């Protein structure tokens, strides 16, 4: 009566270690990944439904951990800049500088160490206002992190380009994927297929806007753990890109300073041509249409005649109040208030966002490990696809939404929401009419 069957097609929810694969000096060491399958297979499961939950998906946690650990390993061999924690004697840059950019750059000089222990050298360099603090309340200044953390120079040969990786299941596991074009992140998913590896995902880091991800295939999607709870984020995925063009219109020079045997510091040298403010342009008509689509869908949760208003972010550190990104190797902090300034009532041009630049970066919102971004010579221009927003509710007929930042995890759960990891359990039994 009891018949034992091996190879039974059943599974259970499971948490395991995933490995990366890559389709082939990068900060994320993507060369360390397993080469991908040039033609991966996908199997449709007929008559199979499954329950998914993107808010409890541990694939997000592994991606978060791998990214931070790789980032830290990439700085391990790079030169430390601790000899720079000196008193800087410093004044402003006033040569051909545009107003409202005036006061942003400073010309500082100091006594730096050199190749021999017995010698000192006088050097000078330019710094951005956001990287220094005044101590002598020319005036004495110090680098902003000298009383809290070590500063490590990023290696100039290492790229920060967000080259995508694929996550792949180990033997004994499978990754289930949703195909439902309207899936909102939780509950039954009527159309499921299996893959061994995920689509390539770019480890892009941003705050208020998501700059280079996937677009919704059909309708604009609004996803949240609750919607109702004002303590939760709302992730909005666009079904069309919004093009954004960013620039740093200052032709800079770069020079190296030897600070000890085998070690050098890269300093901003001087500026060729006039000094101008960094900025980003967003097409105006596209932005307007894009919000109109978002509002029509937000209203489904708030009421047919509910008014929706957008407002800018709350006060706080640039890292949480501005739109930040790494592009061309520079770290931009842009003012987004021009994008969130409207009230939506029931029934060519551009928006220019001014930006600030910082060289001393606390990359993962951790304290004690500061990275110094060496300057880049020449002029930087970037073009990217805005694919979505992170919004919060500002919380009786009007709702107000504000952009905001969030955990790094929220920028990855937006791509991994369709995937689930299960383990295969091949043994099972059933009654039959046979006996040995």
């Amino acid at each position, epitope marked *: 009566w009891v018949t034992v069957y091996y190879g039974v097609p059943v599974w259970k929810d499971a948490e395991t270690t995933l490995f990366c694969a890559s389709d082939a000096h990068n900060v994320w060491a993507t060369h360390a990944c397993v080469p991908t399958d040039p033609n991966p297979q996908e199997i449709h499961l*007929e008559n199979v439904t499954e329950e998914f939950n993107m808010w409890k998906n541990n694939m997000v946690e592994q991606m978060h951990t791998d990214i931070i650990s790789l980032w830290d390993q990439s700085l391990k061999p790079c030169v430390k800049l601790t000899p720079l924690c000196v008193t800087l004697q410093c004044t402003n840059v006033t040569n051909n500088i545009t107003d409202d950019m005036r006061g942003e750059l400073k010309n500082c000089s100091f006594n730096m160490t050199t190749e021999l222990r017995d010698k000192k050298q006088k050097v000078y360099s330019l710094f951005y206002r956001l990287d220094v603090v005044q101590i002598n309340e020319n005036k004495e200044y110090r680098l902003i992190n000298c009383n809290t953390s070590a500063i490590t120079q990023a290696c100039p040969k290492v790229s920060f380009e967000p080259i995508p990786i694929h996550y792949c299941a180990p033997a004994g596991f499978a990754i289930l994927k949703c195909k439902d*074009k309207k899936f909102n992140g939780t509950g039954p998913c*009527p159309s499921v297929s299996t893959v061994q590896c995920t689509h390539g995902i770019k480890p892009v880091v941003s705050t208020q806007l998501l700059l280079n991800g996937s677009l919704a295939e*059909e*309708e604009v999607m609004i996803r949240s753990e609750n919607i109702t709870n004002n303590a939760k984020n709302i992730l909005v995925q666009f079904n069309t890109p919004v093009q954004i063009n960013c620039t740093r219109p200052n032709n800079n020079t770069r020079k190296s300073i030897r600070i000890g045997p085998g070690q050098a510091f890269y300093a901003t040298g001087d500026i060729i041509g006039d000094i101008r403010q960094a900025h980003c342009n967003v097409s105006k008509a596209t932005w307007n249409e894009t919000l109109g689509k978002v509002v029509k869908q937000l209203r489904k949760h708030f009421g047919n005649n509910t008014i929706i208003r957008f407002a800018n972010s709350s006060g706080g550190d640039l890292e949480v109040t501005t739109h930040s990104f790494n592009c061309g190797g520079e770290f931009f902090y842009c003012n987004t208030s021009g994008l969130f300034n409207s009230t939506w009532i029931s029934n060519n041009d551009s928006i220019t966002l001014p930006c600030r630049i910082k060289q001393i970066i606390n990359m993962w919102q951790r304290i004690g490990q500061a990275m110094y971004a060496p300057p880049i010579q020449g002029v930087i221009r970037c073009v990217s696809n805005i694919t979505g927003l992170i919004l919060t509710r500002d919380g009786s007929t009007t709702e107000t939404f504000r952009p905001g930042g969030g955990d790094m995890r929220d920028n990855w759960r937006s791509e991994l929401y369709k995937y689930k990891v299960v383990k295969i359990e091949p043994l099972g039994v059933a009654p039959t009419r046979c006996k040995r």
Partner: antibody
Amino acid sequence: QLVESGGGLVKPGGTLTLTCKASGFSLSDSYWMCWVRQAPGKGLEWVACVFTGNGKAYYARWVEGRFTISRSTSLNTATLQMTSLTAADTATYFCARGDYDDPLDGVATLWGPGTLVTV
Amino acid sequence: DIVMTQTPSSVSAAVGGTVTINCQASESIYSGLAWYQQKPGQPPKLLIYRASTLTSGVSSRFKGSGSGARFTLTINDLECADAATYYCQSCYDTTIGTYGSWAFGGGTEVVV
């Protein structure tokens, strides 16, 4: 609410473009604009669909690149471009509007009188 | 990629009384079925959606049910109400994950 045009006789190997104009509603909202065809003999089959909210479209397997479906919210119309036509493509073509909301999701509720294409 | 099979191709009745039409999906469509009535000379009219809900352009005379991959339509009383060809339509293509891919079976001619 749906008015079709562009029917007529196609010399075999030629092309023909059909149109369907919306009246009384906007294509700027989330609707599916789809074409089906009814063969002489009353066989009925799906040809293609486009989502007006994005321009995304799906085609029947038998199309194999011979048909292109698109929409324009500024004209408030949708069209179907057919090429490499043969005698077998003779049919009454119809446009219909499917809803994108929870009730009637994917359901064609609005149908226009169709138009005849012969080849 | 969903194929619907409709049977019988020809159904008839004496005037008064009921007939049925069956339709079988090649794969479960999780009840994403619509029924249409096409009289000669017009486009099909929608009678029933999501397997059993009426459009109110049709009376209780047209009833139906089903789930998964198998559905039926019952016409409770035939008063020479029509000489329509009835069609079974899938409104959801599970192989894509959308409502943008439709399939029709052949129709059934009802004679009375």
